[model samples]
Target: DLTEDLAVAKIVKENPVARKMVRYILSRGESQNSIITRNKLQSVIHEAAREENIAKPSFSKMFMDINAILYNVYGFELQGLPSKNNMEPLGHRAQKFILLNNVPHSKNFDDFKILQSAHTYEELIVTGEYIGDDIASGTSNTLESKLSTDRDLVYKGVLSVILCIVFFSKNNILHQELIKFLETFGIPSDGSKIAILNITIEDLIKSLEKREYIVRLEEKSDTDGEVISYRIGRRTQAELGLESLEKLVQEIMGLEKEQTKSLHDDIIKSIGDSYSI
Candidate 1:
């Protein structure tokens, strides 16, 4: 369904004017009300037309064509009640326009109808929204806004969980296995959720690359020459100093060490008291 939605979006974006208008309209949308009055929407269209030097009958046709594309092709609707101006006895109804998130599409729809195919991992990195909670942690206000659509607590807790898994990993993890591991943490691995995770992983890799904490490598697997496996780049050894890395590693493990010690002591005490009784 997400692919179907993305496919339609890819199609609607083929028109330059339509694409510009879509960006503007999506930009105006917020968490509360994603509404655009006809006046405001018309202003954007007029501004775009003026900027493009379109005028008169040509402009009228362009406007009408754009309306047809948005209404028929994109499926945007004129939503909500009409504004009534009884004092002046205005007969025209001014309806507010809105894009419903629940876009209609068939599961069997052809992807190439919009573009060549479904989105690739690289394409996801460029255009997809990162939805996990972990990536936004410790981010500044600007980074946080860039990383997320809202400040929901649900997302804020996922990335840290992944970091712990990564810390426990054998320095590197394969792409396929990583998704399987993430599934254990209740991270959805199917449909759009997988796409979201792909984007998040790509961002994480970039961040790690930026910090010189890890390097990514793609090598042909021993099982099959065509099957590639990801590995930690040698730069991980050359760049991240052993002492500094160890100290950081110890810091994360130290919390668990202390908790484990307490648990062990409690169990020993309980067994000793039961024997005395």
Candidate 2:
């Protein structure tokens, strides 16, 4: 069945190491940085390169094979996700290779494909639109973009929701106001919606600050007590493109596409020091 993929047939035959790396990444991806540092891969890289009578490995060549398999099969790819401070671990690229979603997304959702193996493709009934991911034959292949049990997905969803809130609210919001909004989304301020987290919501909220997905501002001591506020983070714009969020807002309003977009453009300009930024 693996051989059916003529694209990767040669790469697999010529470099079993590439095959091994592909398997390694797919297996490692289940529970995860999805990170693959060069130092950690030194032994495998060295072993493969030496077999080809090369004392020095062509990093790019190995990656070409790896990326080919990754992009072809698993619907993912790897890229360099540098440190936040842009700090270097060494003179060379010691830490690199970060996995990313290669799946196609659309507002229509019709363009999406599973990129399944031949067997999976054969078993699945072809259709104009995929409704759900309920037919999981195995636990191993569980990257379905579903929203339950997976704390990571919940965390991501919560983060994106908050980002949208902050962005639309002129990039500023208070804790109480945010709590009210989050509760509306079934994410109660107290309830353990994030049971796996086994902690309070604020801790996870603090994580966003650490990750720079949101910025917490100075506390305003009030008659009630310490009051904290939140604002947009530098990483927010880069990680979640502004374009995608605007589409989301457009959808939420139920306004015709590009109708609210123009309204948003006007509102953005009026907000001060911004023409859609």
Candidate 3:
């Protein structure tokens, strides 16, 4: 129901047509009853339409559309909003699979076909890209029957692939022999040794542990009684079984090389375009 305040009533009655509609609504038998305000307004509009020989407005549908827009703008009370956390289950699985199988982040969507699972990595990648774009632009689109086994797995898989890419990119430097050589010393108290490598060794070690990219083993205790250790980590003989991992690294390197070459080519082309003798 509209406000009973004189100011609001005056505004409502400002136009003859609007005043008539309000009058019709106030005169309704159900107006004073427990009927909803929207229902009363709709009834008034209907009567106004019949009197004026005009088509009745579909207030129900319009209200639904408006409610949907509002819901999107101001998310649900308890749920807050759909976010990356919603896809955690599937995303974590994908991460485990990538880490256990040693799949490279550089591998294209097509390479993941070897997984032989119903959900193609390509679909996951595309769905994630689309969903991310939608969320970024304040929109939502449902995914239906896109993932075969589980309804929500599509999102989970997408999240997984995204995390895998991030993990690979962040730790890619660890693959360098120099980094591995530094690891032999362990993280020093002074941290200057790690500084030369451009990373905090403590943080690097924690990341390595989480990714299972490096395993710390205790060797014989030194005179200082500090345990020595290393791993079947990056570029080691233990990684020989990680064919996918090797290919993924190669793919990443190749992609960077291609990108660099393309940038140089574009620069030359631009120069030629502007500098025709």
Candidate 4:
């Protein structure tokens, strides 16, 4: 039965030692369903212990602590929820959730939370001070649960707020990476202009109708351990008018030429006191 990952997760739930060991493993950093399985397994174990009247260790406290530790290594996308909360669910209330959706150069392979990659292009260059409460609220220590019932409206409202913050955060013009992204992909520079393709594969897909650069290229999505694919470029060519798309693409290509090295080290480093990603 251990061959089934969820079965192993079941065992991990009933054993405090297993829960602690698994949580420790996950706190080290990973963005995968396996980690969620471990977390839910411990949740199950706690539930079992409570049912049996077995004296259990304070695993929920550790679970919350671990969540605090790894919250930002991947962020959450909540569905039908306006705010994130720590009570009741003990995690953000989920209408639906997406995790770790913002890796660059992913093309159609990218996962999205509020379509962050496309929406918040400024996130690439902004410093710690300018990120505002959304970033703070996003971290595990500060999730807010009081959002309105209209999740989509609330998320849209948040986007507008964040955009104003991003605009005022600096007078600096658009950075090169974004130009490259648009050059290669042909999506709009303004994230708000894009309509998220209907969810056919458990992640947001970009509409080709709105794109000028990418054409007829298929993006894949994982569904029940299988793949679902869709095309991007074929639908948008008529609307993009050659002159503008060509100019945008050229500008982006120049930006790509400039970005061969990382400006910051991938790892966070400190002395004596330390945080591990």
Stretches of model 1 off by over 4 angstroms after superposition = 1-15, 30-32, 56-80, 84-95, 102-277
lDDT of each: 0.45, 0.60, 0.38, 0.34
TM-score of 3: 0.22
Candidate 4 Cα deviation (angstroms), residue 195: 16
Which 10-residue span in candidate 4 carries the lowest summed lDDT?
267-276
- For every model shown, the clashing-pair count is 2, 0, 0, 7
| Residue-level lDDT tens digits of model 3 in 83-152 | 2223221221221111112223554675564354444544534644533444453322234333343334
Top candidate on lDDT is 2
Error of 4 at 89 (Å): 22
Over 4 Å off, model 4: 1-7, 10-51, 58-108, 111-154, 157-257, 260-277
TM-score of each: 0.27, 0.55, 0.22, 0.23
Which digits, one per residue and each the tens of the lDDT, describe model 2 over residues 1-277? 6653777777788777677667776666444533456676677667766786657647667766677777877767665443444422122343555566667667665324322332343443255222145445454234563233334544666777787677667776898888988788767666564554455578878977866567787865557678889877544443444455555656567755656636656545432321123
Instruction: Compare candidates 2 and 3 on lDDT and give the better one.
Output: 2
Candidate 3's C-alpha runs over 4 A off are 1-199, 222-225, 233-241, 252-277
* Pairs of residues clashing in candidate 4: 13-45, 84-144, 101-111, 179-252, 215-233, 216-233, 216-234
Q: Comparing 2 and 4 by TM-score, which wins? A: 2
